[PDB]
Amino acid sequence: VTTFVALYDYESRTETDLSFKKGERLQILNSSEGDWWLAHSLTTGETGYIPSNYVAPS
């Protein structure tokens, strides 16, 4: 799986994380380990780390 869906809204608090809305679709190439994964929003075009407990497969 390389495309995920946001289950909850999240608002960035730093330069390295990514704000997204529930239902946004996110390309995540490495979901192997970590509580934070690098994501690219297909829905909006922005990029950054997201909390792994906030997404589902898409």
Swiss-Prot record:
Concerning PTM, the database record says:
The phosphorylated form is termed pp60c-src.
Q: SH3 domain: from which residue to which, for each copy?
A: 1-58
Q: In which tissues is it expressed?
A: Expressed to high levels, and with a high degree of kinase activity, in certain fully differentiated cells such as neurons, platelets and macrophages. Isoform 1 is widely expressed. Isoform 2 is expressed only in the muscle.
The listed locations are: Cell membrane; Mitochondrion inner membrane; Endosome membrane; Nucleus
Which gene specifies this protein's sequence? SRC
* Functional note: Non-receptor protein tyrosine kinase which is activated following engagement of many different classes of cellular receptors including immune response receptors, integrins and other adhesion receptors, receptor protein tyrosine kinases, G protein-coupled receptors as well as cytokine receptors. Participates in signaling pathways that control a diverse spectrum of biological activities including gene transcription, immune response, cell adhesion, cell cycle progression, apoptosis, migration, and transformation.
| Domain of life assignment | Eukaryota
Q: Which family does it belong to?
A: Belongs to the protein kinase superfamily. Tyr protein kinase family. SRC subfamily.
Assembly, per entry: Forms a complex with polyoma virus middle T antigen. Interacts with AFAP-110. Interacts with GJA1 and PXN.
Protein name according to UniProt: Proto-oncogene tyrosine-protein kinase Src
